[PDB]
Structure 1
Amino acid sequence: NVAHGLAWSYYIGYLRLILPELQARIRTYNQHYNNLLRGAVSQRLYILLPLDCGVPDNLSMADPNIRFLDKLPQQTADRAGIKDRVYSNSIYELLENGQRAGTCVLEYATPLQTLFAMSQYSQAGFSREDRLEQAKLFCQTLEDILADAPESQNNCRLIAYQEPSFSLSQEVLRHLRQE
């Protein structure tokens, strides 16, 4: 199925490649001479999973309390004929009552944005019902992959959610405080 191939691709072509190297990049950042006067960037990759597939490119276009802080040092790898392909990650400050409450590596699961754009193209033969059905199935398959994964050694956190006011900052802060 669509969700099946996408969840396995997200694992094989992304998470299994960057999760083993993520602890070191966050250590390199937290130990850099310019970040000591700020709260430490929490470990783990926080992956936003909106089941509606509403994936904006800017995280401050989802909540004002999610302000971009910096980029982690880049990861490079020779990938399918591409010499030094780049894997980049962004650090975000989380606000609670106008004050810094958490610092973390945060992004959206990129295949969710693909499922959305797919349902918009007539040639894809993919409905809005198919989009909701496949979004849930992608989140499930990902969880099942990670549950038996040796790359997931407490290196990432899946944040699945539905919008009916909603606070994305609160939803993330809730996962970060669980540690």
Structure 2
Amino acid sequence: SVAHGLAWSYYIGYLRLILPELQARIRTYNQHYNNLLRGAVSQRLYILLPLDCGVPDNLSMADPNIRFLDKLPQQTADRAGIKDRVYSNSIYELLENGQRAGTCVLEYATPLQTLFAMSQYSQAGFSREDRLEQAKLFCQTLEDILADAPESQNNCRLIAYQESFSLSQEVLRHLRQE
């Protein structure tokens, strides 16, 4: 299926390359002299899985209580002819009643953004019903992959949701479960 291919390639081609290096990047950030007077950034990459495929590029636009804090130090790796291919990731503070309640590395799974966009292209022959069905399957397959890869599972958390809705409250429940 479309979802099976996307979930496996997102895992092999992105998560499997960044998750073994994430812990050390977070620790480097947390131990840096410019960051010692702030709360520690939580371990793990928090992956947003909107089942409606509504993927904005700016997280603060989807919820004002999600405030951009900083970028992690970048990771580089030679990848398929791209020398020093750069992996950047962003740190966000989660606000509860105007107060900092948590800090974590957060992003959306970009194949959910491309699934939404595919349904809009006449040439793709991909309906809104296809988009909905494949987005759910993408999330299920990604869960199945990560469950059987404990090394990858311990360094990430999948945040699935349907869409007043509070995205910050959803991230905070996962952040507090730890």
Normalised to the residue count of structure 1, the TM-score between the two structures is 0.98
Return the alpha-carbon distance in structure 2 between the equivalents of residues 150 and 174 of structure 1. Answer: 22
Contact 1:74 1:87 in 2 (8 A): yes
- Listed one character per residue, the Cα deviations across residues 60-87 of structure 1 (whole Å, up to 9, x for unaligned) are 1100000100000000010101100000
Return the alpha-carbon distance in structure 2 between the equivalents of residues 87 and 20 of structure 1. Answer: 13
Structure 1 stretch 151-160 or stretch 45-54: which is displaced more?
Answer: 151-160
- Listed one character per residue, the Cα deviations across residues 106-142 of structure 1 (whole Å, up to 9, x for unaligned) are 0000000000000000000000000000000000000
Indicate the residue corresponding to 2:68 in structure 1: 68
Contact 2:47 2:159 in 1 (8 A): yes
3-state SS in 2 of match to 1:143: helix
Contact 2:46 2:104 in 1 (8 A): yes
Indicate the residue corresponding to 2:166 in structure 1: 167
Cα distance change of structure 1 residues 50 and 153 upon mapping to structure 2, 3 Å threshold = closer
Indicate the residue corresponding to 1:153 in structure 2: 153
Return the alpha-carbon distance in structure 1 between the equivalents of residues 106 and 28 of structure 2. Answer: 17
| Paired positions, count | 178
RMSD: 0.7
Structure 1 segments of 4 or more deviating over 3 A?
A: none
Return the alpha-carbon distance in structure 2 between the equivalents of residues 78 and 20 of structure 1. Answer: 15
Contact 2:146 2:153 in 1 (8 A): no
| Stretches of structure 2 lacking an aligned partner (at least 5 in a row) | none
Return the alpha-carbon distance in structure 1 between the equivalents of residues 152 and 6 of structure 2. Answer: 18
Deviation, structure 1 residue 150: 4.2
Deviation, structure 1 residue 151: 3.3
Indicate the residue corresponding to 2:81 in structure 1: 81
Deviation, structure 1 residue 153: 4.7
3-state SS in 2 of match to 1:152: helix
Return the alpha-carbon distance in structure 2 between the equivalents of residues 7 and 118 of structure 1. Answer: 16
Normalised to the residue count of structure 2, the TM-score between the two structures is 0.99
Cα distance change of structure 1 residues 49 and 153 upon mapping to structure 2, 3 Å threshold = closer
The structure with the greater share of residues assigned to helix is 2
3-state SS in 2 of match to 1:166: coil
Return the alpha-carbon distance in structure 2 between the equivalents of residues 151 and 9 of structure 1. Answer: 18
- Listed one character per residue, the Cα deviations across residues 6-48 of structure 1 (whole Å, up to 9, x for unaligned) are 0001000000110010000000000000001000000000000
Return the alpha-carbon distance in structure 1 between the equivalents of residues 75 and 104 of structure 2. Answer: 18
- Listed one character per residue, the Cα deviations across residues 93-112 of structure 1 (whole Å, up to 9, x for unaligned) are 00000000000000000000
Return the alpha-carbon distance in structure 1 between the equivalents of residues 107 and 53 of structure 2. Answer: 13
